[PDB]
Amino acid sequence: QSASQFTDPTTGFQFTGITDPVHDVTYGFVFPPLATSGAQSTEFIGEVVAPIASKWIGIALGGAMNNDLLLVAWANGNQIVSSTRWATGYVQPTAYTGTATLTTLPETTINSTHWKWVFRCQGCTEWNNGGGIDVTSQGVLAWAFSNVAVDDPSDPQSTFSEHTDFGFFGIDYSTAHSANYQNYLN
Amino acid sequence: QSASQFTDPTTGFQFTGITDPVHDVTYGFVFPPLATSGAQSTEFIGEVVAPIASKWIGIALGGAMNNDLLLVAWANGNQIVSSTRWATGYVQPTAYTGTATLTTLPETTINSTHWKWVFRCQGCTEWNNGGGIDVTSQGVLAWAFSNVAVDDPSDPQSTFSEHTDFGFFGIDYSTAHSANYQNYLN
Ligand code: HEM
Ligand code: HEM
Numbered sequence: 387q388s389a390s391q392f393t394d395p396t397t398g399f400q401f402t403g404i405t406d407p408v409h410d411v412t413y414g415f416v417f418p419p420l421a422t423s424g425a426q427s428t429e430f431i432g433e434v435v436a437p438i439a440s441k442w443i444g445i446a447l448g449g450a451m452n453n454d455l456l457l458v459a460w461a462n463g464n465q466i467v468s469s470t471r472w473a474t475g476y477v478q479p480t481a482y483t484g485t486a487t488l489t490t491l492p493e494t495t496i497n498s499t500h501w502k503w504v505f506r507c508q509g510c511t512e513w514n515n516g517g518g519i520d521v522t523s524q525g526v527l528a529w530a531f532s533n534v535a536v537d538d539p540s541d542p543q544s545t546f547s548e549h550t551d552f553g554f555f556g557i558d559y560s561t562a563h564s565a566n567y568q569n570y571l572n
Numbered sequence: 573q574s575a576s577q578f579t580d581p582t583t584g585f586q587f588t589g590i591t592d593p594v595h596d597v598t599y600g601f602v603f604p605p606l607a608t609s610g611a612q613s614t615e616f617i618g619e620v621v622a623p624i625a626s627k628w629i630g631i632a633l634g635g636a637m638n639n640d641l642l643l644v645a646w647a648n649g650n651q652i653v654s655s656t657r658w659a660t661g662y663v664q665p666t667a668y669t670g671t672a673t674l675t676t677l678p679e680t681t682i683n684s685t686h687w688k689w690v691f692r693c694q695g696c697t698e699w700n701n702g703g704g705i706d707v708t709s710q711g712v713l714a715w716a717f718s719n720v721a722v723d724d725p726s727d728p729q730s731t732f733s734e735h736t737d738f739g740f741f742g743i744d745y746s747t748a749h750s751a752n753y754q755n756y757l758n
């Protein structure tokens with residue numbers, strides 16, 4: 387599939403991403419302004435808008451399950467529980483051992499039909515194995531879905547069962563930067 | 573997703589299509605030679621190679637659920653049960669009333685791990701609603717998957733439950749024609 391630009395209706399944030407039509411989960415990404423005189427920033431802002439029947443959602447930042455930074459999130463009552471994870475060999479991903487900071491932003495909402503997770507991800511484009519994303523070029527992102535809740539929803543590091551669906555989308559990161567990035571943070 | 577050319581290792585048939593990595597179902601299509609003078613053929617040969625956990629598979633020949641010819645098939649023991657369907661709305665598709673003939677070809681195989689449906693679809697590029705596929709250009713196909721059995725597997729017109737997954741892929745029909753099509757029919 388292929389990402390495209392869209393605007394968040396409520397917040398007005400401008401993102402690049404997709405809506406998966408099967409589970410109707412929207413995934414959006416926006417990046418700080420492209421640099422030419424400095425190395426690119428290692429952070430970005432993302433959003434996941436998911437029907438409440440989505441019991442956990444994962445994002446694979448390099449487009450594959452193994453050896454890339456994973457984000458995993460679920461709603462637990464009125465809050466989002468989230469974590470950075472990593473997998474080798476197609477088993478339960480565990481806590482990421484590098485430096486990566488997930489901040490839930492206040493645009494985040496949980497209501498009766500959907501959870502909307504808006505987050506800042508610092509240190510997420512470059513990983514502690516030397517891998518990472520090139521935000522000036524074209525890449526692939528992947529997502530994972532489950533409609534079965536995690537084993538222990540109040541634990542960010544909870545274990546859980548394999549996803550019931552997963553998918554990919556191509557993204558042109560060079561078009562995903564915003565001059566308004568700093569304001570999304572305030 | 574995007575289709576690509578591939579050869580069936582067993583049969584040697586050359587197809588254009590994809591493998592869905594989630595359910596590991598392969599969809600392949602091949603068309604008779606393009607005509608130099610006159611109308612194109614309205615038939616094609618297809619194959620679905622599915623793990624036996626695949627309880628029913630659908631193909632939407634115009635890429636959407638409604639207003640296009642649908643093919644539905646499932647394994648019933650050592651036989652493939654299949655039918656042409658049509659959907660008015662997002663509800664149980666019913667028997668297609670147009671001129672479309674599905675023939676199971678002798679290369680069809682059911683073993684302990686997979687069912688491989690090889691079929692001829694006559695009159696399947698043009699439908700009785702006036703629409704159809706343009707075999708000289710580029711289009712979109714879609715597939716539907718269920719891991720739950722149909723209500724009566726021996727009835728080709730069986731009712732069944734909504735798919736548990738569905739997906740799309742682009743296909744360049746202009747490169748999906750084969751000089752060996754006649755040989756596939758023999
Ligand atoms: C206990 C939980 C997990 C298990 C046992 C598991 C297992 C698997 C297996 C067996 C596959 C291969 C499926 C196929 O190709 O037929 C797979 C693929 C994949 N998984 Fe997971 N998974 C789990 C959690 C996750 C999470 C949390 C994410 C994302 C944050 C993830 C993302 C993916 C992706 C994107 C793929 C497809 C690409 C690839 O093959 O690398 N998985 N997973
Ligand atoms: C009782 C059986 C069926 C029911 C109730 C049903 C229901 C639905 C629903 C509610 C959607 C919209 C899903 C979404 O966008 O969230 C849909 C999508 C779709 N269905 Fe079905 N469906 C059934 C059978 C089939 C079959 C037999 C096929 C193909 C042979 C098919 C092909 C598709 C496709 C390709 C889509 C996505 C594109 C579109 O929205 O038209 N469906 N179906």
Ligand SMILES: *[C@@H]1O[C@H](CO)[C@@H](O[C@@H]2O[C@H](CO)[C@@H](O[C@@H]3O[C@H](CO)[C@@H](O)[C@H](O)[C@@H]3O)[C@H](O)[C@H]2NC(C)=O)[C@H](O)[C@H]1NC(C)=O
Nearest residue numbers: 394395396410412435436437495496497498499500501502
């Ligand atoms: C619960 O949260 C969900 C997710 O944020 C909310 O759904 C969304 O509501 C907004 C505003 O009503 C919808 O926005 C717009 O779409 C309509 C339809 O085309 C358009 O006419 C408007 O101009 C605007 O662009 C949005 O599409 C919808 N998003 C989702 C994924 O459904 C919902 O508002 C919240 N419900 C409650 C309990 O407050």
Ligand SMILES: *[C@@H]1O[C@H](CO)[C@@H](O[C@@H]2O[C@H](CO)[C@@H](O[C@@H]3O[C@H](CO)[C@@H](O)[C@H](O)[C@@H]3O)[C@H](O)[C@H]2NC(C)=O)[C@H](O)[C@H]1NC(C)=O
Nearest residue numbers: 580581582596598621622623681682683684685686687688
């Ligand atoms: C049931 O039928 C399926 C489908 O025909 C069988 O799977 C297929 O088996 C063939 C081997 O005859 C595989 O081709 C092989 O692929 C490898 C590369 O991975 C290549 O090195 C070989 O030369 C050959 O081309 C084919 O990939 C495989 N297809 C799938 C979807 O798995 C299956 O083995 C049969 N099961 C039984 C129990 O007989």
